């Protein structure tokens, strides 16, 4: 309540006779710029509108600028109705009121600011909390309330998953047949998956031109905030030439992450394999269970580090740009970290287990043939509920236990019960998204029940997903977007290696795994080259298909800007005669 | 001369009496929308334009109206220095101003009008065709020059064929180098070749970003001239989905040109192979010559009147696309005579002739080692110099000597003599250009010298073929294009199996042929796995580079429709006593 827009709050570091300095700096440049700062703080900066005119013109001096930048290509209604006719709309003017440079607090670094943020509509929340865990699917009016609060960014999450959820109830069926007549690794079973997982990319790389063109953000990335940390050396500027002498060293750290994370993978895998020869036996189960829960959460919290001090180097002027590039390089810690330990099943022990049971050195064997079956159980059913209460439910009882021991004006507790909250990143929540599609292509002939186990976890994690974003974390600022990002270029790439992995292993698992036995010669490597070329040839047939048919949305794009052109543009021997006797000419020539 | 710029010439087919009343519509409807038409004829028709001020209404007609779709992009300049500034740019008027509905002789059917052509200007060729007959790269206003006459869709031919020419002294000095000091098969030849011929698909693709935007001409693919052959239904129109339904017939026939010309050419390649074994020796060598070069000239003549038939099926509105649908039919056909007689050598005999010596139904054996390189000579080499002589010398005699047996105004012969000659096509000259790009990434190993006997061949090819345009065909309207079309999509592909094809050529040819020897298991399928899967996480490390490096004509167009805009735009509880007593709150909290 109360008409607060954001707030500012501040970190009594150091000693106070600068920062009493420091404190008119950042209250003198917003009343010089904004109005209405105020603060009953402790110490967090309360911060409004100005008035009912000088906020007007910011909205129409932004909804000019990403104009003439080529994105919103109406044109800009004037002052006098520039109503800003949404709650995230008139949010996002102020923060660009906030940080832009030319008023910057820098809310980050360079200063001594922690945070700003907005605060939640609690009633809008409750009556949509409730309303929509009846139904079954959210409108697209519900949707543009995802939109009209919460900016955008977090507005192409709850729409991508939603069309993930739509798309789930056919494998889901069809798997559930494939279960119940078939057995497991049918060859009719994994054509359609993997025809299944061209569709949905295709569909989905047309569906965000309408939708990014819908909520008029077609272009954004002509219009991103700078960063702040950039070091140029020139002006009217740093050369993207410099870059690709720079970025290259980005492939010697993926060379280390799989080496680094490899080993301690595979070491553990190696471990829990060697008690079933010698093993005392219950005690040393959990021996390599307890070094890989430790080590890969502590060795690729050492790889984000080495990654932030190598994104630092190349400069990336804007701020998505920065954020792409870190994300790009987290992705191999993640395809290494979360398939491997099921790579390494699959294909090692039923290739072979004879060769590697005579190593005794970490002190007759048949296999056990469900090892496999019965570890592809165990993400995509039973990870998929102990990472249900460790996202939602666990850290909604610290925060709760939290202020239990700790017990006019009585939201000033609410508002710094809301400030110490956790902050939301959309990118921590695709990750989950991106990788469980992974075992849906890369994984899905053992145990085809798997989109069964993806379509109840996605109808509750599409209404998890927006409670903890009410209730067990502050709101994100508007942020604007006009696709998920990195993660659609590395969905595809997903499904690529999905294509080879499953007709590898529907060939191996033909009846008998018996880990020397199976050809390879005209068998292993000629269904590889045959099954992922003709996965290449159908790719290249959709999406030529869906290319010819433009959606209505970014149909009307196209005759707006037409339109838009239509009204700017509104604001010597020759004796025959003419043509009645040229043509005598003609009529007297008839042989 | 004589400021003529068309010419409309007449068949005399039928019963003159409605082709009295027929020349009057021809003439009638002319003269309503353009001035001067005239004839002098025999029959055909001159058109010059109409005024000094009627002819400046169309051009700032068609200025406007490719503005407001997109192209231009600046402002029209207005009727008073509307000059064209640009030959070809005042016939490409002229011929919109004649061929458009709303105009009509629409000169290939549905009337008795055979052919629209304007004249050449003999003393522009002149000192051009003996001016860049001496350098060795022709310059960027050398270029525009033929760019301003010809239209741009000839412009982007010879641009392209000049900067093929300018990357090909790479592989020439290199390979010259791999012929002199290594043998052939080099792992390290066709490691670079492969690296080669990625990087100038790549800066291609970045090339054409530049030129058809340098021209003014990036976008036309929203302005073009419709079809008169087109069969709607509806109004403000034939559904796109329909296509998709009737488009999937296209595979069925690329089925049956791959099974009836895969005959031909594998009849006769079996039958001398015969002649190696049984054979009177000299007189039964060219009966397989014969054979194969007079059924695929008849077969493939076939396959065009099928593929016609079957293209006029699909209505495609546009003039361009079906033209571009034609060509990707064809190509099936050109892929499938050119490559298949020497896939055929290298992929059967020195695998195995043992298996195919002891059939003898076509009325002791070693491999004639050199059948394959000797074949690989005939196309680079021998075929380039008696396709020289096929294309441009023989047609010019024929056309000298049919004049020598016929022997105030003398030119009307020259027109008439004009008149007569051929009608050029670039499409017909790019396949000539985009097939001898396969032989240099497909069989570029056997005989390394093959860049050597290519760039030989494309500087005299550039002056031919601007030879053969000027004296041996008339020419051609016109016509303005962003790309060159099909085969740039088509030359990607080229170079994709060009990697699988040499990388499978190097490990059979690891100093022994010996048409079931080497091993396939481990070694062939997994040379082709791991090489291809080079290809194309370099191919996709090359073009994400050149992405980031935007040049300076696609600058300077972003720049510019930002300032289009810029000028279409030049057309309760609060009590705390603003900032100064605000900050006074701060400074008391201390501890
Ligand atoms: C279950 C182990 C038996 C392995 C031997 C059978 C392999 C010989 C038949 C090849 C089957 C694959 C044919 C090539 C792939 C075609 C798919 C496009
Ligand atoms: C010349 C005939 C000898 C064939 C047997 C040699 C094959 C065994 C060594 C494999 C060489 C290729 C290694 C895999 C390709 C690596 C290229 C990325
Ligand atoms: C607009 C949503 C279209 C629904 C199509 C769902 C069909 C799922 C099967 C996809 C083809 C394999
Ligand atoms: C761990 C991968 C290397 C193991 C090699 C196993 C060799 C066993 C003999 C099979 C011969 C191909
Ligand atoms: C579309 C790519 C998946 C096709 C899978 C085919 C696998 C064929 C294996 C047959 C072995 C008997
Ligand atoms: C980028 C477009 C790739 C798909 C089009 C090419 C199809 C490649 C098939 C190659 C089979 C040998
Ligand atoms: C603008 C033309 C650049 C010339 C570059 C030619 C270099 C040819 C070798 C290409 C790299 C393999
Ligand atoms: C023309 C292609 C089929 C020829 C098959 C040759 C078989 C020879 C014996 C080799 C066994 C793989
Ligand atoms: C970049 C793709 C071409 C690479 C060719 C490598 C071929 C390796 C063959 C080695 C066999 C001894
Ligand atoms: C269309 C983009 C294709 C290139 C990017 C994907 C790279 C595929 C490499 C897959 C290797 C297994
Ligand atoms: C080991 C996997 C390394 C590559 C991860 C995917 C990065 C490419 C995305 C297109
Ligand atoms: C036998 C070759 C058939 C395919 C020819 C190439 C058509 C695809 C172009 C991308
Ligand atoms: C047989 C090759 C087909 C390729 C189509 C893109
Ligand atoms: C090892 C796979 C690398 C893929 C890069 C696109
Ligand atoms: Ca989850
Ligand atoms: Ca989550
Ligand atoms: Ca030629
Ligand atoms: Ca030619």
Not at 61 to 75: A, H, M, P
Not at 310 to 317: H, S
Not at 411 to 421: G, H, I, K, M, Q
Not at 439 to 446: E, G, K, M
């Amino acid at each position: 309540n109360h008409h607060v827009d954001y707030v500012i709050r501040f970190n009594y570091g150091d000693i106070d006779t600068p920062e009493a300095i420091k404190k008119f700096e950042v209250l003198l440049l917003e009343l010089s710029e904004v109005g209405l700062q105020t603060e009953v703080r402790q110490l967090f900066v309360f911060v409004r509108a100005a008035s009912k005119k000088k906020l007007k013109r910011a909205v129409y001096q932004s909804r000019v600028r990403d104009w003439l930048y080529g994105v919103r290509n109406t044109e800009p209604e004037p002052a006098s109705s520039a109503k800003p006719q949404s709650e995230a709309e008139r949010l996002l003017v102020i923060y660009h009121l906030i940080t832009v440079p030319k008023i910057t607090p820098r809310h980050g670094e360079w200063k001594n600011v922690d945070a700003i943020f907005p605060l939640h509509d609690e009633e809008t929340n409750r009556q949509c909390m409730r309303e929509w865990s009846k139904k079954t699917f959210l409108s697209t009016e519900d949707l543009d309330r995802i939109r009209n609060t919460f900016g955008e960014h977090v507005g192409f999450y709850f729409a991508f998953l939603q069309s993930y959820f739509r798309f789930l109830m056919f494998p889901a069926a069809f798997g559930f047949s494939c279960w119940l007549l078939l057995g497991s690794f049918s060859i009719i079973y994994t054509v359609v998956n993997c025809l299944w997982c061209i569709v949905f990319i295709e569909y989905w790389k047309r569906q965000e031109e309408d939708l990014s063109c819908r909520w008029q953000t077609k272009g954004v990335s002509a219009v991103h905030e700078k960063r702040a940390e950039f070091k140029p050396e020139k002006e009217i500027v740093f050369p993207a030439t410099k870059r690709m002498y720079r970025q290259l060293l980005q492939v010697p750290f993926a060379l280390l992450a799989a080496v680094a994370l490899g080993a301690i993978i595979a070491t553990c895998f190696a471990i829990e394999i060697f008690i079933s020869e010698v093993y005392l036996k219950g005690y040393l189960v959990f021996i390599p269970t307890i070094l890989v829960s430790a080590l890969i959460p502590t060795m690729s919290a050492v790889l984000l580090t080495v990654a932030t001090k190598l994104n630092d180097y190349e400069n990336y002027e804007t701020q998505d740009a920065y954020k792409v590039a870190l994300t790009q390089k987290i992705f191999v810690v993640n395809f290494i970290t979360s398939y491997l330990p099921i790579i390494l099943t699959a294909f090692v022990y039923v290739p072979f287990a004879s060769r590697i049971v005579p190593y005794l050195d970490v002190f007759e064997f048949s296999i056990n043939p469900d090892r496999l079956r019965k570890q592809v159980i165990y993400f995509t059913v039973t990870a998929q509920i102990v990472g249900f209460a460790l996202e939602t439910i666990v850290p909604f009882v610290k925060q709760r236990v939290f202020r239990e021991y700790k017990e006019e004006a009585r939201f000033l507790t609410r508002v710094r019960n809301e400030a110490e909250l956790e902050d939301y990143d959309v990118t921590d929540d695709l990750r989950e998204m991106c990788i469980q599609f992974g075992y849906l292509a890369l994984f899905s002939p053992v145990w085809p029940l798997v989109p069964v186990s993806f379509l109840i976890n996605n109808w509750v994690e599409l209404r998890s997903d927006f409670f903890k974003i009410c209730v067990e974390c502050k709101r994100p600022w508007p942020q604007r977007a006009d696709t998920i990002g990195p993660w659609l270029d590395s969905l595809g790439f997903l499904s690529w290696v999905g294509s080879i992995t499953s007709s590898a292993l529907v060939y191996m698992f033909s009846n008998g795994h018996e880990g020397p036995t199976t050809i390879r010669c005209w068998a292993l490597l000629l269904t590889i080259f045959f099954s992922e070329h003709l996965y290449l040839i159908v790719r290249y047939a959709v999406r030529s298909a869906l290319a010819k048919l433009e959606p209505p949305n970014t149909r009307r794009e196209r005759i707006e800007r037409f339109m838009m052109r239509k009204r700017y543009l509104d604001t010597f021997w020759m004796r025959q005669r003419g043509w009645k006797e040229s043509a005598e000419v003609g009529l007297s020539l008839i042989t």
